[PDB]
Design a protein around this motif. Structure first.
Motif, short mmCIF file in Angstrom:
data_model
loop_
_atom_site.label_atom_id
_atom_site.label_comp_id
_atom_site.label_asym_id
_atom_site.label_seq_id
_atom_site.Cartn_x
_atom_site.Cartn_y
_atom_site.Cartn_z
N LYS A 1002 9.89 -0.21 -6.52
CA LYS A 1002 9.83 -1.48 -7.23
C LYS A 1002 9.24 -2.60 -6.37
O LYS A 1002 8.44 -3.40 -6.88
CB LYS A 1002 11.22 -1.88 -7.73
N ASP A 1003 9.60 -2.66 -5.09
CA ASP A 1003 8.98 -3.65 -4.20
C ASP A 1003 7.52 -3.31 -3.94
O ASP A 1003 6.70 -4.21 -3.72
CB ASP A 1003 9.76 -3.75 -2.89
N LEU A 1004 7.17 -2.02 -3.96
CA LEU A 1004 5.77 -1.63 -3.82
C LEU A 1004 4.95 -2.06 -5.04
O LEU A 1004 3.82 -2.53 -4.90
CB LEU A 1004 5.67 -0.11 -3.59
N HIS A 1005 5.53 -1.94 -6.24
CA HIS A 1005 4.91 -2.49 -7.44
C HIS A 1005 4.87 -4.02 -7.43
O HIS A 1005 3.98 -4.60 -8.07
CB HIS A 1005 5.65 -2.01 -8.69
N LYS A 1006 5.81 -4.67 -6.74
CA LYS A 1006 5.76 -6.13 -6.59
C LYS A 1006 4.60 -6.55 -5.68
O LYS A 1006 3.84 -7.47 -6.01
CB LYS A 1006 7.10 -6.64 -6.06
N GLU A 1007 4.46 -5.90 -4.53
CA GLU A 1007 3.33 -6.20 -3.65
C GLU A 1007 1.99 -5.73 -4.20
O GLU A 1007 0.96 -6.29 -3.82
CB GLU A 1007 3.55 -5.61 -2.25
N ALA A 1008 1.98 -4.74 -5.09
CA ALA A 1008 0.74 -4.38 -5.78
C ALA A 1008 0.27 -5.48 -6.72
O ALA A 1008 -0.94 -5.65 -6.90
CB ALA A 1008 0.92 -3.07 -6.54
N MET A 1009 1.20 -6.22 -7.33
CA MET A 1009 0.85 -7.41 -8.09
C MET A 1009 0.53 -8.59 -7.18
O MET A 1009 -0.35 -9.40 -7.52
CB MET A 1009 2.01 -7.78 -9.03
N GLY A 1010 1.20 -8.69 -6.03
CA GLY A 1010 0.92 -9.77 -5.09
C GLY A 1010 -0.47 -9.69 -4.48
O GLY A 1010 -1.18 -10.69 -4.39
N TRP A 1011 -0.89 -8.49 -4.08
CA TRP A 1011 -2.24 -8.30 -3.57
C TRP A 1011 -3.28 -8.46 -4.68
O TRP A 1011 -4.40 -8.91 -4.41
CB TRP A 1011 -2.39 -6.93 -2.91
N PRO A 1049 -4.35 2.20 -9.63
CA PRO A 1049 -4.78 1.05 -10.44
C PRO A 1049 -3.93 0.79 -11.67
O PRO A 1049 -4.15 -0.23 -12.34
CB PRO A 1049 -6.22 1.43 -10.85
N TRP A 1050 -2.97 1.66 -11.99
CA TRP A 1050 -2.13 1.49 -13.18
C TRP A 1050 -0.97 0.54 -12.85
O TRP A 1050 0.18 0.94 -12.69
CB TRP A 1050 -1.63 2.84 -13.67
N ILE A 1051 -1.31 -0.74 -12.75
CA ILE A 1051 -0.31 -1.76 -12.47
C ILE A 1051 0.17 -2.41 -13.76
O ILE A 1051 1.32 -2.86 -13.86
CB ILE A 1051 -0.87 -2.80 -11.48
N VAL A 1052 -0.70 -2.47 -14.77
CA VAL A 1052 -0.35 -3.06 -16.05
C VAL A 1052 -0.47 -2.01 -17.15
O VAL A 1052 -1.48 -1.33 -17.27
CB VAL A 1052 -1.24 -4.28 -16.37
#
Ligand SMILES: [Mg+2]
Length: 1052
Positions: A1002-1011, A1049-1052
RNA sequence: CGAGAGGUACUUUUCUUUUCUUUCUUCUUCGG
RNA sequence: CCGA
């Protein structure tokens, strides 16, 4: 051919063991009998009709079996009949070469970067018994008269070598053993029907380390110095992971590491200086606790001098890479030469806390690191000394559950039996009393939660200059008004739930309503167990920080030591109102937080549910069809897109808007789209595995939701109202028999449901509750809350194994295929008498209650024995052996509340397991019940962009080897394909890492949105740069030599 | 014919299977 | 990891 112990069927009862020994040595060879034991019902004057004899070799055992089969053993007009025994009388390997006598055993670890060895202590004249059948090796180390058995298993050994002390390669006189875990240490403590040929009339108990310098606890490497290893290479080749290579070593002098504390594998912080930071030293010591860096490789000045003067982030990102690699780094200086604000902000938004988790063994300690865990109330109101919190659990040497025989061993002394506390008892008590001392700190006992007591864990805090361990304890409340030993410890773990904080309600906003209760037939009952009232707008203000559009009617809430749900009234006039049955202590804080609000999650069909519903006249033939209708849409999920929506819209979350639901309707076939094809295949493998293991037959007509009581007065004993929400399949056919679409989302019921709890064992827990309809109940807005009647004889939550109303689930289903018309009377609800002391708690009785919770804890065997005694015995769940187990379960679930143990008796264990279990070691038997049919029914079924990509790759690939996941689908879904040794026996410890990897990614998905927002802020232009991210992962020409990831690339 | 002495005369007269337990150190169950 |  595994053991040599033979059981004789019919020996005379007028003999002694010497008369049988002389007969066996007269028929067979001389002194060929090692052990002989005749069991006695009395102490020394009533032998039984059988006896056990253990021979010295297999040839004399086969000769005795051949003489017994030909009827040639006549002992006082009795024909002896030989058979097979269960285990050896003495655990001794039957091999003349495996029993190494008078050898040299030394302990230590590799000191330098080469393959050297520094010795702390030396043991001369020890034994060595290699037990191939039992898959372990044991040593007998004599010291100061008494001996100590050191058991080493085969799974703990990871590297077997062949060394040479004398320098010559042909003179192989040493065998180096590398232990991943620690060894089990035993101790010898101090007549007519036993001959036994040797000195074996004693007993083994598990004690702590026997050495005065405590060398064994820091002795992860062994060195078995033999007299002359020439033909022993064929025996040592049977050891697992044996490297077939000869390698020399150097015997370094190593008597410097001589500590006297109970916590042995710690570096001397007074030598290296007290000015060292804790964040680097704790990671450097946890690397020593892991099998990556030895003691001498980290305690040298050439590592402290190059790591002291640097930044804290740069010295940590090069120390995490030492834990990234799986190879044992011998030279840590060479690795760091090739290796070269947000933490406080990220706690109040996603409950991200990095706690230092520890694992205390009976020999050493295992520190893990600042692992991402869910932040509770206390660490969120104490977000200034986060490096002083520590989770301490007491486990075995192989990180397993501590049994009831490793501590408090029973010994009949005098007239009655008495439990004898061994050295593990006084070690765990000394650790709980004094504490651990790593770095320039000392962790003291704060408290422990309700689930920490079952998992043998505890919370620890370090007394700093600002706060201490007593101040954080009195900040929760005052526990002097509780005269119990178990309740005073249980109320200190009440304010430790995983919650999200809300605004603070002042002390003037209290309103105490007088409660209601009924007393029928001398039995005390109550309806206001933990319920309360709340206003319409207060649900909006408590839902403004949680993001809840749909207002829940009932939700569990906690503040100031109060616990339970609150209900929404449409005639509300104040902000907050409380009942009197919430008070546990007189606290001094009122900060509000919510744990879990409301969710309309569909149910399943558990094992005990079938066990309690296959008794009341409901047939067993429909249980196969109830899983056939599920596997008909589960089996064709891999090759179709129509079953993939039905097996994902109600399997994991009803209104679950995830990545597997957006590409389900407007998506392609599972032959293409590998990002969809991977997780759907592993969800199919999960849905078959968790159906084969446990009964999880899904039904769409049932739900699971939190219940509450309502102040209406219309509802009576035997009638409730179920205002359920419409799912994705409930809106396809609104006109039903028992269902009624009262609105678009709210689909009320008009049928009859069954209400039970998650643990149930008594047939009185089944109850029929008809769902009725009223305008006054539908105008109150009771959405996602099964309401309960206000008056009657006894409350219907209390009918389900004595359940209260404090934020607990309820299994409901309005299915009409069952026949619940046959009804059984309920059981009792009052537990044992409480134990009140005449003084106050001196903070040692809590230690005694925590240590004695490990022993006399038979909660893991009652639900097993009930499930087997309902399979093997007809008229199941109604015999006496089911009623005693149902009473013992209700007495054992109250062991965390009151200090009354369960005391599971003998002549009630089944000693035989059915087919629907994973116990492949017990002598199982084919089950003829409905559970065996349901177990066979699943066997019948199973027959710019580049820099971001490269940084996501290195941010993701570390936790796969760090957690043990072999693929990306094992770590990104939750379920790993491979299992460890202790995780294969503990479901609760498996769920820990299962939730912990999801909380980590979940934090990795948070930093994937942050970057992503750091690269570009525009959303309309982001769809043109996401095409390059899709193309570098889809096209094979842009794939490099490394293993690229498709879930990037599947962030959204 | 009454008194005092010694002697024959109640002997087992109701215990219950004689097969009753030590092959031990072993997964709590549910939902986020 | 957390709540019966
Ligand atoms: Mg409850």
């Amino acid at each position: 051919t595994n053991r040599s112990t033979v059981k004789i069927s019919n020996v005379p009862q007028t003999i002694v063991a010497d008369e049988l020994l002389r007969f066996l040595e007269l028929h067979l060879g001389e002194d060929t009998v090692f052990a002989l034991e005749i069991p006695t019902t009395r102490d020394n004057w009533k032998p039984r009709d059988f006896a056990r004899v253990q021979f010295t070799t297999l040839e004399v055992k086969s000769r005795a079996q051949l003489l017994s089969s030909q009827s040639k053993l006549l002992f006082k007009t009795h024909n002896l009949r030989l058979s097979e025994a269960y285990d050896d009388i003495i655990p001794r390997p039957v091999d003349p070469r495996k029993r190494l006598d008078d050898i040299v055993l030394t302990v230590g670890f590799p000191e330098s970067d080469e393959k050297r060895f520094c010795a702390l202590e030396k043991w001369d004249g020890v034994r060595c018994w290699i037990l191939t059948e039992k898959r372990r090796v044991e040593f007998w180390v004599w010291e100061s008269g008494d001996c100590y058995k050191i058991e080493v298993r085969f799974e703990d050994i990871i590297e077997t070598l062949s060394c040479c002390v004398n320098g010559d390669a042909s003179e192989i006189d040493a065998f180096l053993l590398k232990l991943k875990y620690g060894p089990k240490v035993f101790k010898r403590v101090t007549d007519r029907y036993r001959f036994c040929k040797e000195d074996f009339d004693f007993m083994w108990i598990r004690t702590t380390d026997f050495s005065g310098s405590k060398s064994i606890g820091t002795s992860t490497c062994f060195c078995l110095e033999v007299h002359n290893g020439s033909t022993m290479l064929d025996i040592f080749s049977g050891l697992p992971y044996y490297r077939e290579d000869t390698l020399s070593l150097t015997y370094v002098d190593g008597k410097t590491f001589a500590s006297a504390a109970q916590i042995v594998p710690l570096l001397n912080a007074a030598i290296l200086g007290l000015e060292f930071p804790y964040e680097i030293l704790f990671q450097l010591n946890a690397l020593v606790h892991a099998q990556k860096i030895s003691l001498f490789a980290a305690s040298d000045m050439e590592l402290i001098k190059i790591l002291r003067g640097m930044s804290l982030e740069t010295a940590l990102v090069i120390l995490k890479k030492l834990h990234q690699q799986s190879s044992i780094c011998y030279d840590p200086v060479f690795f760091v030469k090739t290796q070269m604000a947000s933490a406080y902000k990220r706690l109040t938004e996603q409950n991200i806390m990095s706690c230092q988790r520890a694992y205390v063994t009976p020999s050493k300690i295992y520190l893990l690191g600042p692992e991402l865990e869910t932040a509770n109330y206390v660490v969120k109101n104490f977000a200034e000394h986060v490096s002083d919190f520590m989770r301490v659990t007491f486990v075995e040497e192989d990180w397993s559950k501590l049994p009831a025989n490793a501590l408090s061993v029973n010994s009949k002394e005098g007239y009655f039996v008495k439990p004898s506390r061994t050295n593990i008892y006084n070690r765990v008590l000394s650790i709980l009393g004094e504490g651990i001392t790593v770095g320039p700190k000392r962790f003291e006992f704060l408290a422990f939660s309700a689930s920490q007591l079952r998992g043998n864990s505890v919370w620890m805090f370090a007394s700093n200059e600002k706060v201490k361990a007593e101040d954080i304890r009195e900040w929760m409340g005052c526990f002097r008004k509780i005269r119990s030993i178990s309740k005073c410890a249980a109320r200190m773990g009440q304010l430790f739930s995983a919650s999200r904080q809300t605004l603070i309600v002042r002390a003037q906003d209290v309103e105490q309503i007088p409660d209601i209760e009924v007393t029928t037939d001398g039995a005390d009952y109550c309806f206001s167990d933990g319920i309360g009232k709340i206003s319409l707008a207060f649900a909006k203000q408590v839902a403004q920080k949680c993001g809840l559009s749909h207002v829940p009617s009932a939700f569990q809430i906690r503040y100031g030591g109060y616990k339970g749900v609150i209900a929404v009234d449409r005639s509300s006039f104040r902000k907050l109102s409380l009942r009197d049955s919430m008070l546990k202590f007189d606290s001094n804080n009122r900060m509000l937080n919510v744990t879990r609000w409301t969710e309309s999650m569909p149910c399943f069909l558990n094992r005990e549910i079938i066990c309690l519903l296959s008794t009341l006249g409901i047939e067993d033939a429909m249980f196969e069809a109830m899983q056939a209708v599920h596997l008909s849409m589960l089996g064709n999920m891999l090759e179709d897109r129509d079953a993939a929506l039905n097996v994902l819209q109600k399997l994991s979350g009803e209104n679950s808007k995830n990545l597997l639901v957006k590409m389900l309707l407007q998506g392609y076939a599972p032959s293409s789209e590998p990002y969809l094809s991977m997780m759907l295949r592993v969800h199919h493998e999960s849905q078959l595995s968790e159906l084969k293991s446990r009964c999880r037959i899904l039904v769409p007509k049932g739900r699971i939701l939190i219940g509450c009581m309502d102040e209406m007065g219309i509802l009576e004993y035997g009638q409730v109202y179920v205002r359920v929400t419409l799912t994705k399949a409930e809106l396809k056919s609104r006109d039903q028999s028992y269902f009624r679409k009262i609105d678009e989302e709210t689909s009320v019921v008009i049928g009859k449901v069954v209400v039970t709890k998650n643990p149930c064992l008594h047939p009185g827990d089944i109850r029929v509750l008809d769902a009725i309809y009223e305008v006054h109940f539908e105008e109150k807005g009771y959405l996602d809350c099964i309401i309960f009647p206000q008056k009657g004889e006894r409350p219907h939550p209390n009918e389900c194994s004595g359940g209260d109303l404090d934020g607990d689930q309820f299994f409901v289903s309005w299915d009409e295929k069952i026949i619940p018309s046959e009804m059984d009377p309920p059981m009792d609800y009052a537990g044992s008498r409480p134990r009140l002391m005449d003084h106050d708690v001196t903070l040692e009785e809590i230690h005694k209650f925590f240590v004695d919770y490990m022993i006399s804890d038979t909660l893991g065997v009652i639900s097993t024995a009930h499930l087997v005694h309902a399979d093997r015995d007809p008229e199941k769940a109604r015999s006496q052996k089911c009623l005693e187990l149902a009473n013992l379960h209700s007495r054992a679930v109250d062991f965390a509340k009151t200090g009354a143990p369960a005391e599971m008796p003998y002549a009630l264990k089944p000693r035989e397991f059915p087919d629907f279990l994973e116990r492949f070691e017990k002598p199982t038997y084919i089950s003829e019940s409905v559970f065996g049919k349901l177990y066979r029914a699943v066997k019948s079924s199973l027959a710019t962009a580049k820099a971001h990509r490269d940084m996501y790759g290195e941010k993701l690939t570390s936790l796969m080897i760090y957690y043990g996941a072999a693929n990306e689908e094992e770590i990104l879904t939750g379920i790993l394909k491979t299992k460890e040794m202790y995780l294969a026996r503990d479901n609760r410890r498996y769920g820990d890492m299962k939730d912990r990897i999801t909380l980590s990614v979940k934090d990795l998905h948070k930093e994937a949105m942050g970057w992503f927002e750091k690269s570009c802020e525009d959303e309309q232009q982001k769809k043109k740069l996401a095409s390059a991210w899709y193309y570098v992962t889809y096209n094979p020409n842009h794939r490099d030599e490394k293993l690229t990831f498709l879930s990037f690339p599947w962030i959204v």
